[PDB]
Structure formats: structure tokens, C-alpha cells
């Protein structure tokens, strides 16, 4: 799968609108498992279930544990660039 970089716009009150699985301890990439309707990832239209999150705003998540990826992702604000590939 070709790498894509996708920008989403998040207001402060809302989450990213995704569920993720995986991470280093699981021996698989951080994977989008759900796209929540009406939330930023859905509104932006470039992120899909089955996409691996390789990086976010230039933070490499290829080798991060699940919880650390969650924390990094949950810290992002405003306009947020995802580097993703469909697995």
C-alpha cells in the first residue's frame, strides 16, 4: 500500500473519532479499527478501517507500545497530519 498523508481538523472538545488496536507489544502496527460517524476522522474522509498509523504530526509510531501511541495521539490539537498505509 502507498503511504498517504492525511490532514484532519479537530476542535478541542472532540476526539479524533477513531478506535485503534495493535502496537509494538502486539507485534502489529497501530491499526484503525473503527471510524466514528460525525467525528473528525469521518469528516476528513481519508482514513479508513484497516489503515495502519505509521506516524502522527511527525511522531513515528511504528515501534511504540499501544498506550504510548494512545497518549501521543490524544495530545494532538487542531490540524493533525496522519501518515498511514492500508494493510
Amino acid at each position: 500500500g502507498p503511504i498517504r498523508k492525511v490532514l484532519l481538523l479537530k476542535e478541542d472538545h472532540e476526539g479524533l473519532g477513531i478506535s485503534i488496536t495493535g502496537g509494538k507489544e502486539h507485534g502489529v502496527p497501530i491499526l484503525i479499527s473503527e471510524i466514528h460517524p460525525g467525528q473528525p476522522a469521518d469528516r476528513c474522509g481519508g482514513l479508513h478501517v484497516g489503515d495502519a498509523i505509521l506516524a502522527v504530526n511527525g511522531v513515528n509510531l511504528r515501534d511504540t507500545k499501544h498506550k504510548e501511541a494512545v497518549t501521543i495521539l490524544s495530545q494532538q490539537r487542531g490540524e493533525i497530519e496522519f501518515e498511514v498505509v492500508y494493510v
Partner: peptide
């Protein structure tokens, strides 16, 4: 026994 987090 599966890790899934909503974000």
C-alpha cells in the same frame, strides 16, 4: 483479551 482504545 484484546486491546482497543477509542480516541
Amino acid at each position: 483479551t484484546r486491546r482497543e482504545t477509542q480516541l
